[PDB]
Amino acid sequence: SMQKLQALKDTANRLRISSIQATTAAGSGHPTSCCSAAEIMAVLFFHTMRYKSQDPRNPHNDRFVLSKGHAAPILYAVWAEAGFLAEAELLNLRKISSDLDGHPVPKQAFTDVATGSLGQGLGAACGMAYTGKYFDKASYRVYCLLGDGELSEGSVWEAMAFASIYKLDNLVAILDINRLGQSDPAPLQHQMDIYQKRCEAFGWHAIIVDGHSVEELCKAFGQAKHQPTAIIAKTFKGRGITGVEDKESWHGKPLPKNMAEQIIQEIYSQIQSKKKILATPPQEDAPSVDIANIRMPSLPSYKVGDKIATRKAYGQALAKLGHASDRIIALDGDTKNSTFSEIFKKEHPDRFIECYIAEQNMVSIAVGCATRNRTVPFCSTFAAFFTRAFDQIRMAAISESNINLCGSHCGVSIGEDGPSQMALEDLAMFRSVPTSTVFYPSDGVATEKAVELAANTKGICFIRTSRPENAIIYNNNEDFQVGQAKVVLKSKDDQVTVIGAGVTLHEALAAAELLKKEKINIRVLDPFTIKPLDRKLILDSARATKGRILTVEDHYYEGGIGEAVSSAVVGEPGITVTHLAVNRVPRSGKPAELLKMFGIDRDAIAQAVRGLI
Amino acid sequence: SMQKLQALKDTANRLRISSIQATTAAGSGHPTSCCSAAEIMAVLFFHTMRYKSQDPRNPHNDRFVLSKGHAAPILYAVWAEAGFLAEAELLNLRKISSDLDGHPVPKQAFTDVATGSLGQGLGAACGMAYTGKYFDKASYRVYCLLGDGELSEGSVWEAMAFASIYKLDNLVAILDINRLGQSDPAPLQHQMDIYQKRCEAFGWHAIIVDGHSVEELCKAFGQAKHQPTAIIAKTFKGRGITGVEDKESWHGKPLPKNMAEQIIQEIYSQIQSKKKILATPPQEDAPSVDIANIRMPSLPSYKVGDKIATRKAYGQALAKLGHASDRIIALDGDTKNSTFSEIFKKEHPDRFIECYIAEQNMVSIAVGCATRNRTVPFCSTFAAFFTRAFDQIRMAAISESNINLCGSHCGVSIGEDGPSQMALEDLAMFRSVPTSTVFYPSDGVATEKAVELAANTKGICFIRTSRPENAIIYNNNEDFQVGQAKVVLKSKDDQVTVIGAGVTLHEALAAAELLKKEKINIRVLDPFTIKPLDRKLILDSARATKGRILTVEDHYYEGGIGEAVSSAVVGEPGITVTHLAVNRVPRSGKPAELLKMFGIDRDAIAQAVRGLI
Numbered sequence A, B: 001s002m003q004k005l006q007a008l009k010d011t012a013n014r015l016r017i018s019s020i021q022a023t024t025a026a027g028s029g030h031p032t033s034c035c036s037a038a039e040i041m042a043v044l045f046f047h048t049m050r051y052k053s054q055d056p057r058n059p060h061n062d063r064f065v066l067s068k069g070h071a072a073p074i075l076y077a078v079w080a081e082a083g084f085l086a087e088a089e090l091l092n093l094r095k096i097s098s099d100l101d102g103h104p105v106p107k108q109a110f111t112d113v114a115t116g117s118l119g120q121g122l123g124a125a126c127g128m129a130y131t132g133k134y135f136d137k138a139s140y141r142v143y144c145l146l147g148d149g150e151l152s153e154g155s156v157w158e159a160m161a162f163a164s165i166y167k168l169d170n171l172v173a174i175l176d177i178n179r180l181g182q183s184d185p186a187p188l189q190h191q192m193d194i195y196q197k198r199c200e201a202f203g204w205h206a207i208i209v210d211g212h213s214v215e216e217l218c219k220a221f222g223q224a225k226h227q228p229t230a231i232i233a234k235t236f237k238g239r240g241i242t243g244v245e246d247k248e249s250w251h252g253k254p255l256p257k258n259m260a261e262q263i264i265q266e267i268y269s270q271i272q273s274k275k276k277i278l279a280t281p282p283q284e285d286a287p288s289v290d291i292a293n294i295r296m297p298s299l300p301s302y303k304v305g306d307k308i309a310t311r312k313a314y315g316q317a318l319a320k321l322g323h324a325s326d327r328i329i330a331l332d333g334d335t336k337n338s339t340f341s342e343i344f345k346k347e348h349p350d351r352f353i354e355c356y357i358a359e360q361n362m363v364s365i366a367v368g369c370a371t372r373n374r375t376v377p378f379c380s381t382f383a384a385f386f387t388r389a390f391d392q393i394r395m396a397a398i399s400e401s402n403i404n405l406c407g408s409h410c411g412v413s414i415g416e417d418g419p420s421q422m423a424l425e426d427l428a429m430f431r432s433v434p435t436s437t438v439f440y441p442s443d444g445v446a447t448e449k450a451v452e453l454a455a456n457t458k459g460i461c462f463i464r465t466s467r468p469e470n471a472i473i474y475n476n477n478e479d480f481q482v483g484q485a486k487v488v489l490k491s492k493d494d495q496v497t498v499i500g501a502g503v504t505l506h507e508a509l510a511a512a513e514l515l516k517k518e519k520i521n522i523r524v525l526d527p528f529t530i531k532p533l534d535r536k537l538i539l540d541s542a543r544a545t546k547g548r549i550l551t552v553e554d555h556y557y558e559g560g561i562g563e564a565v566s567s568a569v570v571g572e573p574g575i576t577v578t579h580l581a582v583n584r585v586p587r588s589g590k591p592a593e594l595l596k597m598f599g600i601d602r603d604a605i606a607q608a609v610r611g612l613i
C-alpha cells in the first residue's frame, strides 16, 4: 500500500529516464511531453488498467489510446516495463530498422490506431468504448491521454459530446494540462477551473488532480463512474528535468548527451527500489466474433429497366447485408434520410450509430469500432462532407483500418442545392488515400455488389453514390470484382471508347442512341472501380476503337476518372485520350440543366465524339 | 415604440410568407428552417443592424453571416424587404436563370462567404470581427446565425474559443434552437440551460431568449457587450405553419401548392400593416485600403550554393513582404517555430494571428479577413494538417476567396517524425480545388518569388514548403511567373527529361552528376507551379530528349505531379512518361533513408534513367 504507492513513483521515474535515453539516442523526439505524463502513465499501466501484458491485442484488455502521439517514447517505455518489449530496443526509437516509430502505428501490437495528427484519439476511443458497452457488452474500459494544446481541435469536442450522448461510462479521458503547447502556452494555461467548466458543460464528470501525485491519480481513477470521466491533470512540461521543467522553447527538443547523463543521474537517485510492478489481467467476457467472408443472403432482385437512385440502392443493400452478419454496423451524420442509411436503422436499430453533424468524429468512431476486428462499419453522408474528415481518413490509412465510407450526392447531378452540396473532388481525395478501393457504381445492381465486396476488402473503401434515378442495366446474376470494368455497349464498328460512371454512364448510353441516328457507333465502358482501374479492358477496348478514348465524369478535371485513365495509358502506341469534366465551381439548376451547362450530358458526349471523327 | 414592435412582427410574417412562396415555386428548399428564424431575421435587419440597403458590400456596414445557409430564402427575403432585391425575383429561387441559388454565394452582393457546409460561418464571422476590431478599428459589428444541429460541428467550438481569446465584443452569434436537425431531433433539443453552460464555459456572454418574441430579441441585442455575445433562441421549426410546426419529417420539404395557399392566408391574416421598415445606415469610420499589387521591397538576396530549407525561406520572405504593406497578415496553428512564420511574428507582431491547434478555424479566419479585400492573409501549418481543413478550403473556392496557404514538412523527406506528419496527398487535394494555384518552390529564391506572386494572384494559392536545407540554385535576378517552369540543366545530347520539385529536383541534379560519369546527360526541369503546369516547356523539353519524360515526386502516385504531367501530354506522338513516387504509407527514418526506401532519391532516378536508355 505504501510499498505500491512508492513503486508507482519509482515506475514513473523509470519511465522518464527511458523517454530521455531513447530521444537522446535518436537525436530527436519529445522528452518534455513524455515527462509531464510519467505518473499518469505509471498509474494507468501499473495500477488502474486491466490487461494481458504478453497479448496486447487481446479482446478482453482495457484499451489505451495515446491521443498525444508525440509522447510515443513513454508508451514504448511502459510496454518495456510490462515485459512485452526488450529494454534495449527502446534506444532504437525512430530508426529505419526499428518498429518504434516517432508516433505510434499498428505494426506495433500494443497500438490500435495511429495518432500523430492531434485531436483524433478521443474519437477512436469513443468507438472502442461504444463497441465495449453496446456491441460486445464486455467489462473492458477505454483510457485516452490528451495534451492541453490538443484540446483546441474541434474534433475533440465532437468526441466529448458523443460520449455523453451515448453514456460511455466505460471511457476515461486524461487531460495532460502541462500549460504549454508547441510554440507557446496553451490558451487556458493552468486555469484548471475553466477546463473543468468546459468538460462538465459537455456532460463529463470532471476531476481536477495534481498530475504528479500518484495518490491523487489513484483516487481519481478509483471514483465511481456514472458517465464519461475527465481527469484534468495539472502537470509541468518536462517535469523532473532540472533547468527545463515549465520552460518555453523545449517542445520536441531532445536532451544533448552530456546534459542527459546529469539529468538521468538525478532522476535515478530518486528511485527507492528496482522491483517492477506486474500488470493485472482482465476478466475475459468479450464474445467471440467470427471473421469469415460476409455474403449477401441472396442475389440482387432488381428488374432491368426499373429506375432507382444508387443512393437508395446503397441503403437497401446495406440493410440486406445486415441480415447476413451481426458484425455490420452503420453510422451516419444526420443525413440518413438523404443517404438512405435510415433503411438500415429501421431494420437493425441496435447497430445504427447516429453521429449527428460531426463528420470528423463519425470517421473516428468507425475506425475505433473496427479495431481488433470487432465490427465492419459503413459510414455515410454526402460525399462532399467527407472532405470535412479528410485528415481522419488519411490517419485511418496510416492506422491500416478497414472501414467503409459511402458518400452520396456526388456531382452537379444533385441539381438545386448548388455547389456546397456537390461532391466534385471526392475521387481526387479518395484516390490519394494509400490503401483505398474506390467503387463508382452505375446501377442498383452494381451498388449492391459494391457494398458486398467492400465489406470483404481490406483497407479503406469508398462507394460514390448518386441522387438521380437511373435505369437498372445489369442482370442480377452479373459478376462484379474489384478492378474489373464492364463493356455495356459494343459493336464491330465502334469509333470511340467512351468511359463514364454513374450519371455520365447513362448520358453516354443516351449519347450512343443519338449517335446511332447518324450511323456512328461507340463502345461504352463502366469502370466499376476507379481505383484500381481495369487497364487491360480499357486498352483492349481502345484498340478496337482506332485507339480513341473519351472519358466523361461528374467531377473536376484533377484527380478524377480522366486523369486515372490518362496516366494508365500514356505512351501506349496509337492511344489518344480526351476528357469531359466540370471546369469550375457550379451553381443551382435542374440536374439535366447542370449536366448540359458543365459539358457532361449526352449532347456534349455526342458532340465530343463527332469531333474525334 | 409599440408601432415599431408591431411592424417587426409584421415583417417577421412577411418573411415566412415569402420563404414559403419561393420554396413552393421552386419545388425544393427548406421553408421550416426559414420559419424558425423569422423574428430573428426581422429584428436583425430592421432594428439592430446598421448597413446601407443599396450597397451591401459597403465597408462600413455591419456584417451578417448566415451560417445555416439552407435558410437562404429568408436571407433573400430580407434583402427584398430592404429594397435591394426586386420582390418578384424571389419566386425564381433555385432556377438556372437566377442568382438566388440554393445556398448563398458571393455572386450575390449581399453575401461575402458561401455557406452550405454547416459549421463554418462562425469562423468566417470571427475573421471579419477580428479585422473590424484590430485592423480597420471600425464601429461595425458582425452577426452570425447558426442552427442547433449545426452546433455539433467541432469547427463551431474552435470559433467560440477563438472569439473569447481575442475579445471579439463586436461579434454576436444567434443560435436558432429549434429542437430539430435534418433527420431527427438535435442532441440537446430544448435544454436551453446546457447551451448556456457550454457557451459560458467557452467565454461567451449567453442570453437565453424566446426566439419568437421580438421584444425579448430587441432587449438581448441592446444589452452591454464586454465579450462575444451568444443569443440562444428557443424556437420551433416551421413556426407559424399550422400542422407542421415542431414536427419531425419536414426538413427540406417545401409545402405543396394548395396547402401553401391556406397557410399563407393564415399568416397574412396576422399582419396589421403593409408599411415596410427602413434600414438604418452605419457610421462611416472604416479606413481606406489600397488595392495595389504588393511588391517585395527588394530583390532576393540569397547566394547561389548556400543552403536553406524552403520552409525557412518562406518565413523570411513573408516577413520581408510584411514590410512592403500593412495589408499582409500571417496566421499559424501553433507550428510557427516549425513553419518559420515566427519570423513574421517577431517583425510585425500586431499582424500575426495565433490560431492554436485548430486548422479548420484558421482557414475560416483567413477567409473572413480577406472578405471585402480588407487584408491579404497567409496561413501556415504543416501541409499534412491542411487535410484537416479541406472542407473549409473547398468552401473558400465556392466563396471565391483570395487566401494564401503555406504547407511545410512535405513528403517523406521530413524523416523521423513518420507518416502522420508527412504530406503525401496535398498536391492532389489542392489540385482538386477549382480556383487554386499550386506553387512548389525548389529553393530559397523560388520561395520568395512564390510568396510575392501568391499575394497578387486571385484565388487560393498553396505554397508547398520542405524541411531539408537544399542548395540555392537560382540567382536573385531570376524572373518567375505563374505557369512558367525552368530548365535547370540541359545540353545538346540530353537523353531524358526528368521533372522534379523540392527535394526531388535536388535529387535529380545529383543523379545528373552520377550519370555524367557514364556519359549520360539528362534535362532537368523544375515546374515551379504544379497548377497550372507549363505544358509547352515540358513538351519542348521532351522533344529534345527523344520524347522521354521521367517524373519524380515526394507525394503519392495519385493526383501528384506525375499524373498532372501524364494528363497534359497523353496522346502526343513523341511522348513517353514514367513515374517515380511514393507507393504506400511511410515510416520513420533519416530523410536520405526514406528517399531511398521509397525510390525517389538520386540512385533510383539514375537507375530509372538507365532503364529508359
Ligand SMILES: Cc1ncc(C[n+]2csc(CCOP(=O)(O)OP(=O)(O)O)c2C)c(N)n1
Pocket (backbone or CB within 6 Å): A033, A036, A068, A070, A116, A117, A118, A119, A146, A147, A148, A149, A150, A151, A176, A178, A180, A181, A182, A186, A237, A251, B333, B334, B335, B357, B385, B388
Ligand atoms: C492536427 C495537428 N496539428 C498540428 C500538429 C503539430 N504539433 C505536434 S505536437 C504539437 C503541440 C501539442 O501540444 P500539447 O497538446 O499541449 O501536447 P504536449 O506536448 O504539451 O503534451 C503540435 C502543434 C499535429 N501533430 N497535429
Ligand SMILES: Cc1ncc(C[n+]2csc(CCOP(=O)(O)OP(=O)(O)O)c2C)c(N)n1
Pocket (backbone or CB within 6 Å): A333, A334, A335, A357, A385, A388, B030, B032, B033, B036, B068, B070, B116, B117, B118, B119, B146, B147, B148, B149, B150, B151, B176, B178, B180, B181, B182, B183, B186, B237, B251
Ligand atoms: C457539414 C454538413 N453536414 C451535413 C449537411 C446536411 N444538412 C443540411 S441542413 C442539415 C440539418 C441542419 O439542422 P440545424 O442546424 O438544426 O438547422 P435548421 O434547418 O433546423 O434550422 C443537414 C444535416 C450540411 N449542409 N453540412
Ligand SMILES: [Ca+2]
Pocket (backbone or CB within 6 Å): A147, A148, A149, A176, A177, A178, A179, A180, A181, A186
Ligand atoms: Ca501541453
Ligand SMILES: [Ca+2]
Pocket (backbone or CB within 6 Å): B147, B148, B149, B176, B177, B178, B179, B180, B181, B186, B237
Ligand atoms: Ca435546428
